[PDB]
Amino acid sequence: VTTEILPVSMTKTSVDCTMYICGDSTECSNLLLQYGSFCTQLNRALTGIAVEQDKNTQEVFAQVKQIYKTPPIKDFGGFNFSQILPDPSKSKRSFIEDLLFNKVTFNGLTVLPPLLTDEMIAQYTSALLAGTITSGWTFGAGAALQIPFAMQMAYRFNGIGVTQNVLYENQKLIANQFNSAIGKIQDSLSSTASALGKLQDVVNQNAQALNTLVKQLSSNFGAISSVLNDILSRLCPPEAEVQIDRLITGRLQSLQTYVTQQLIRAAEIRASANLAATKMSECVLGQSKRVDFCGKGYHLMSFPQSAPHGVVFLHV
Amino acid sequence: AYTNSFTRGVYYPDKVFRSSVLHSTQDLFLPFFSNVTWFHDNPVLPFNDGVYFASTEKSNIIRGWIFGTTLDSKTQSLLIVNNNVVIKVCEFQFDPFLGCTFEYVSFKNLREFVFKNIDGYFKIYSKHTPINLVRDLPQGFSALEPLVDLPIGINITRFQTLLALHAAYYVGYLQPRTFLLKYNENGTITDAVDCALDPLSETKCTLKSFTVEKGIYQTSNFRVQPTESIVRFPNITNLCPFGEVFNATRFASVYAWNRKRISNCVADYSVLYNSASFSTFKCYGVCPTKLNDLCFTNVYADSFVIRGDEVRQIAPGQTGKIADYNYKLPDDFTGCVIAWNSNNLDSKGNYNYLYRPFERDILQSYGFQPTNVGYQPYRVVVLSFELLHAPATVCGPKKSTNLVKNKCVNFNFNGLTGTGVLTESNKKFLPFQQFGRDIADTTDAVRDPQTLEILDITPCSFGGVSVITPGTNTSNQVAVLYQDVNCTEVNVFQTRAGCLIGAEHVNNSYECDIPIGAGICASYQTSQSIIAYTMSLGAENSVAYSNNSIAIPTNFTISVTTEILPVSMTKTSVDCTMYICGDSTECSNLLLQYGSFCTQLNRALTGIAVEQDKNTQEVFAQVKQIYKTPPIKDFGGFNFSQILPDPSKSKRSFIEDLLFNKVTFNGLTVLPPLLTDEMIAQYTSALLAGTITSGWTFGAGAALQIPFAMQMAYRFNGIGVTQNVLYENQKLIANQFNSAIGKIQDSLSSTASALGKLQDVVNQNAQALNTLVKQLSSNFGAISSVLNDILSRLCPPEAEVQIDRLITGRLQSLQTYVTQQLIRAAEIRASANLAATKMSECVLGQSKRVDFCGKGYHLMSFPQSAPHGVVFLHVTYVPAQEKNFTTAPAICHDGKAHFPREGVFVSNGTHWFVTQRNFYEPQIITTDNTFVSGNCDVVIGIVNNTVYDP
Amino acid sequence: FTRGVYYPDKVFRSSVLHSTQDLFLPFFSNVTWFHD
Amino acid sequence: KYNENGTITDAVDCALDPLSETKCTLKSFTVEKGIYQTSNFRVQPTESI
Ligand SMILES: *[C@@H]1O[C@H](CO)[C@@H](O[C@@H]2O[C@H](CO)[C@@H](O)[C@H](O)[C@H]2NC(C)=O)[C@H](O)[C@H]1NC(C)=O
Ligand SMILES: *[C@@H]1O[C@H](CO)[C@@H](O[C@@H]2O[C@H](CO)[C@@H](O)[C@H](O)[C@H]2NC(C)=O)[C@H](O)[C@H]1NC(C)=O
Ligand SMILES: *[C@@H]1O[C@H](CO)[C@@H](O[C@@H]2O[C@H](CO)[C@@H](O)[C@H](O)[C@H]2NC(C)=O)[C@H](O)[C@H]1NC(C)=O
Ligand SMILES: *[C@@H]1O[C@H](CO)[C@@H](O[C@@H]2O[C@H](CO)[C@@H](O)[C@H](O)[C@H]2NC(C)=O)[C@H](O)[C@H]1NC(C)=O
Ligand SMILES: *[C@@H]1O[C@H](CO)[C@@H](O[C@@H]2O[C@H](CO)[C@@H](O)[C@H](O)[C@H]2NC(C)=O)[C@H](O)[C@H]1NC(C)=O
Ligand SMILES: *[C@@H]1O[C@H](CO)[C@@H](O)[C@H](O)[C@H]1NC(C)=O
Ligand SMILES: *[C@@H]1O[C@H](CO)[C@@H](O)[C@H](O)[C@H]1NC(C)=O
Ligand SMILES: *[C@@H]1O[C@H](CO)[C@@H](O)[C@H](O)[C@H]1NC(C)=O
Ligand SMILES: *[C@@H]1O[C@H](CO)[C@@H](O)[C@H](O)[C@H]1NC(C)=O
Ligand SMILES: *[C@@H]1O[C@H](CO)[C@@H](O)[C@H](O)[C@H]1NC(C)=O
Ligand SMILES: *[C@@H]1O[C@H](CO)[C@@H](O)[C@H](O)[C@H]1NC(C)=O
Ligand SMILES: *[C@@H]1O[C@H](CO)[C@@H](O)[C@H](O)[C@H]1NC(C)=O
Ligand SMILES: *[C@@H]1O[C@H](CO)[C@@H](O)[C@H](O)[C@H]1NC(C)=O
Ligand SMILES: *[C@@H]1O[C@H](CO)[C@@H](O)[C@H](O)[C@H]1NC(C)=O
Ligand SMILES: *[C@@H]1O[C@H](CO)[C@@H](O)[C@H](O)[C@H]1NC(C)=O
Ligand SMILES: *[C@@H]1O[C@H](CO)[C@@H](O)[C@H](O)[C@H]1NC(C)=O
Ligand SMILES: *[C@@H]1O[C@H](CO)[C@@H](O)[C@H](O)[C@H]1NC(C)=O
């Protein structure tokens, strides 16, 4: 059992260009208007990215038509899934998902919430997992048709060129190797923070971009002072306007730089989300024949787990 | 008495002809639906910042107005009479009724006027229209045209009307509001939106349209305003000894100048400013008018005598006999230099004055005589002002006020101003620290000027405002969301996304329509209103899992679904020279000073345009030859006439015609594609004809004919369904297919939104071009956006400056446009690559990739062309009906364990059969259906049966 | 050692790393020792 | 480095050594494992001509 981690989304930021450039200052606001629609363009660009983030989330997780649940009596032929299934005592996340969630962590700048909360994402992964365990590949193709788990595995074994009698003759061994492999996943995830570095890197990059954008407010850009109020309380309107224009140009340029980088980064996230969505359909809902697509070795099955700003796949 | 002004009080903002356009302007207009005072009676009324006047007439009762400040002949006053329009501005004596630097001589009637007084000009707009109404003002809209503009220079504060005594009138006031005005084809303003009237009007102005589509928009911001001003300075009553310097008995020599420190006092700088005894008063630090609103850490008075011609050297950035050897100021000097003539004071000659940053270099004398201007002595005092952040001791003559805590105020602490809430801090400032600073260099905290306490400054509450609405095609009702605020601070529904007001909160969940955030969506439902709810994630459905039960489908359907992908975008191109300097050599010569920026812009756009043809070819040109169907079409009952080309038409298919009916001078142009719609149709025709008559072989190599029914048998085996199923049910399968295609047509012909993915690309690119053109109207700090207006009015020295401002702004706009086009193109390229992949894997073959070629088990696909993209029709096999069978992993015969070669074992309650997984079709269990491996003591769940041996 | 550092200005700051250039004593430089 | 009470409690001399140079470049008194591009080697003139 191996773990594959992919980013799905990034923080939905939004910036108020007027408050950023001319916070509570009418005198410069009236000059900002002389630059036309630059603020309109900045707002539309950021809004488009924020909307895209919910689209990316849905493409990856909302691939199930119905919310499926496992039976009250769990008998899967010796296969223990209790560490990947939801824990009723908890946001009802699984034990492993709780581990994943513990590893990744006034200037006109705000942050908007996602449409789907962690609770809703967990319900989708729960349905996908419950569906896979009790109906195999059929819940993807159409109706969820119940099948004994051991027989589901026999199908999956034939798919890799191994006659089904091998599974049944060695069923006890196979179930034990599987159960041990899951325990190994927990030991790694609970102790190795770097395991989820791919998701943490996204968080860190976006945090740096926002901090940099704010720090730029302290720059003079040739002005006598970075503070508009200090200019206005000291210089008369003929001279003042000059000092203000220097600050407007520098601050407007800083916003444009920020937005451009967010659009480029968003493209990277979109590509990752598209890959994750592909894997959900080809690794979880079915069985893949594509080499090294769903992990190293001959693919049998996969199980999704949610993570902050992304998805984690356990490939068997 | 008052009435409703409705939409009256709008006038043409200027004298420029416009047509078919929405124009945004800010001016003094009467706010929509405000109340106006109703008169029936000639009182004196306030004029305020401008007056809207309206009246209804029947018998010429209302005949004039008086405008002034006292209206009693003691001041300048404007009298207007209409008996012939007569205007006079004499100081007239006026209960007046109608029974100079300027003079002019020339209910059934509604007379409307706008009176505003700006920079000495009394501007009058008016409109007269016929009416048939006694009770009140008629409702309706008409813009008022400018009629008179009087260059009077008279202050107006109050006004009075004049009636004829042998008609009601209304008075409102104008406000600096923003309006979006709509000009029709004939250049008449026919409608208008008051951007401050309500949240829907606010949305309309934001979107620059009088129509708003369904959805949620971010349109404005909530901002708390200050309620009072707080002014704080040290409670010091000492006055600064400036007289001791400026009225000093004697000044020092410049080689040995004096330096007096001014501190611990109140500095009235209006005395030195207003005094007429000075020859010059030049400030380099701050502006004199503001100087008295500041407080300094110290002021130093440098006192000395120099010769008249040397006075020009007492400044920052100077060199010279004094500036370099006797007295120098730093280039960043902050303060004021004051000097005056001493020819009648120090001159005698007077040889006590000698000559050789702030250095006292402790040599020749000058003989100053009363008969010597440039050779006369001058007394100079330099006042050096320190504005560094430190405890201040020299404050201007400004009275303090009491300080108010935990309120939003406009504050001033020793000259430091801002808006915010003042609270008690826990910051331990050092004895020499007066202020603190945040990361943005804003003030974090301040020590009070009178009390040794530290206050924190927190900006007043604010947040984004979003408007949630069904489209204006259905309803003008809106709900408003205040982002990240408490409902107790701003139907009221508190969500994690903000405070939602106007939407009813309901318990029922539904499919999400207009998303708000944090699990909450809104919609318009029944009578109708906006509601909010937690979104449903889908229906709940448990699975009847057990270790001995399998569900096997007994029937199936054929489903056809549509997948739409963008392939290309418009191949635009921009001429940077024409865009920036259209027909202007004078600025073109300056554009050259920026190097290769134009070359880079041209190459970037050209590269994208070329890519667009590449994308098209990768998707459609995947066929080696152009294939055609036979004149006799017999595909075993399968009707393809709606996807094949129609010979009577660009020979497009019926469905392609539907797809094509749903998607729609400034140096900007558009280039055509290499492959026209006719050529794309030929490629899709060949691909379709190839697939139908040769299946998967035309892709792999040669097109090898195969009967269609046999092609389908192959495709069925590929999904785990034995070919006999196809043949036995061939009539059913063909009928399900034919019906599915008809359904596709019914949807595409009626649902325009079906092709939204292609329309979105078109809309985004159109917006980018329109935005780029609109930027040409911006001044970017210039006196005018028009180069010709600059060149016809300003000389070359000055002009070049105005031009550079426009070049920078216009060049920046082009760079912004190109960057966005390159980013969007990358998205289109990725889509085209996906479409090309699907063509090869879904159309030329058969896919085994789940949900790649539609939901269900893929059988075949057919391409159709569309504007700027490709549409795929995916044909899939979907299980329809199912039954509960008892199962087992193996069967015991002679102790041997029998396993199926294909399929599963099923029990109908009395007998065991073996059947294929994807279709119930029970077979007798025989030695030709099963194989033996291992035995009954190994397999878990093995059951006893009898296996037949032929 | 690390002696010769002073507050560059008179502004209150907290919980921050602030970059400044001024005339400071270089770290671990040698200083003349007098006893004279 | 200013602490919670606004007192300078520590400092980095950006010209002392390559680690201090890295700390200043990264605006932190802690440096993570890896390779950083922090400055430039430049030969100075020795005389005027
Ligand atoms: C599935 O594996 C888990 C291991 O996480 C088993 O849970 C343990 O059960 C033992 C015996 O009751 C307890 O002493 C441990 O404390 C449990 N571990 C945890 C983390 O709670 C669980 O019983 C196994 N289930 C099946 C059906 O095999
Ligand atoms: C195949 O390999 C597995 C281990 O992966 C063998 O199973 C182990 O056998 C040892 C005894 O030698 C036991 O102590 C372990 O507990 C078993 N592991 C598990 C998971 O059961 C298995 O016997 C090998 N099979 C063959 C034919 O060699
Ligand atoms: C126009 O005249 C009015 C008086 O009719 C001026 O307003 C007065 O200003 C003084 C000085 O602040 C106040 O004490 C009075 O109470 C004001 N009177 C009224 C009725 O407001 C007004 O300032 C003049 N306009 C200009 C530009 O000077
Ligand atoms: C394939 O389907 C089309 C339906 O679009 C059939 O065309 C219809 O034929 C009937 C009988 O002649 C006419 O009354 C309808 O007006 C036709 N519809 C249209 C849109 O023209 C076509 O005959 C079918 N072909 C085969 C071989 O089944
Ligand atoms: C499988 O389902 C199909 C429908 O999808 C059944 O075919 C229909 O049968 C009804 C009679 O009950 C007819 O009125 C319809 O016109 C038929 N539809 C078509 C397209 O022919 C079919 O009989 C079912 N097969 C089984 C074994 O139940
Ligand atoms: C209006 O008054 C003027 C005063 O000069 C007079 O000449 C004119 O005839 C009058 N017109 C009417 C209609 O009363
Ligand atoms: C413009 O005026 C013409 C009359 O010359 C009229 O027929 C047309 O309808 C008017 N257009 C609009 C938009 O009012
Ligand atoms: C200097 O004396 C004159 C009277 O001659 C007075 O008007 C002026 O205000 C005095 N200057 C100062 C700074 O007090
Ligand atoms: C303000 O006035 C009080 C007396 O009420 C005095 O004790 C205090 O020192 C004064 N503050 C300053 C800065 O002079
Ligand atoms: C918009 O209004 C028109 C009536 O002019 C109606 O025909 C159309 O169906 C409406 N659009 C929608 C999406 O309801
Ligand atoms: C609003 O304030 C109350 C306290 O009166 C608090 O319980 C509630 O959580 C707050 N809601 C939000 C969105 O801040
Ligand atoms: C939902 O139902 C509960 C009663 O079970 C009630 O208390 C609550 O107010 C209802 N909420 C809404 C939005 O109707
Ligand atoms: C199988 O049995 C379960 C339990 O009685 C029932 O809910 C389910 O609908 C049955 N399925 C079929 C196909 O008969
Ligand atoms: C099982 O199938 C056989 C063969 O058609 C039939 O005779 C028998 O009655 C069926 N059993 C049940 C319970 O329907
Ligand atoms: C199937 O489950 C039942 C109920 O727990 C049990 O009695 C039976 O032995 C199980 N059979 C197999 C093969 O696991
Ligand atoms: C199958 O039959 C054998 C006798 O030959 C018996 O020992 C065994 O228990 C039976 N198995 C089942 C599941 O009934
Ligand atoms: C700040 O001062 C308080 C004493 O008022 C002390 O307890 C705290 O530890 C100090 N904080 C730091 C970072 O030195």
Author numbering:
A (entry chain B): 722 to 811, 813 to 827, 855 to 1065
B (entry chain A): 27 to 66, 80 to 122, 125 to 135, 138 to 142, 166 to 172, 186 to 245, 263 to 444, 447 to 454, ...
C (entry chain B): 32 to 66, 80
D (entry chain B): 278 to 326
What's written in the study?
Coronaviruses gain access to host cells using the homotrimeric transmembrane S glycoprotein protruding from the viral surface. These subunits are responsible for binding to the host cell receptor and fusion of the viral and cellular membranes, respectively. The distal S1 subunit comprises the receptor-binding domain(s), and contributes to stabilization of the prefusion state of the membrane-anchored S2 subunit which contains the fusion machinery.
We report here the design of a prefusion-stabilized SARS-CoV-2 S ectodomain trimer construct engineered to remain in the closed conformation through introduction of an intermolecular disulfide bond. We designed the following pairs of cysteine substitutions aimed at introducing three intermolecular disulfide bonds per trimer: S383C/D985C, G413C/P987C and T385C/T415C. We subsequently determined a 3D reconstruction of SARS-CoV-2 2P DS S at 2.9-Å resolution (applying threefold symmetry). We note that density at the C-terminal stem helix was not resolved in SARS-CoV-2 2P DS S—accounting for six amino acid residues—whereas this region was visible in previously reported apo S maps. We observed decreased S309 binding as a function of temperature for both SARS-CoV-2 2P DS S and SARS-CoV-2 2P S, consistent with the electron microscopy data. Overall, these data indicate that both samples had comparable resistance to thermal denaturation but only SARS-CoV-2 2P DS S was entirely unable to transition from the prefusion to the postfusion state as a result of covalent stapling.
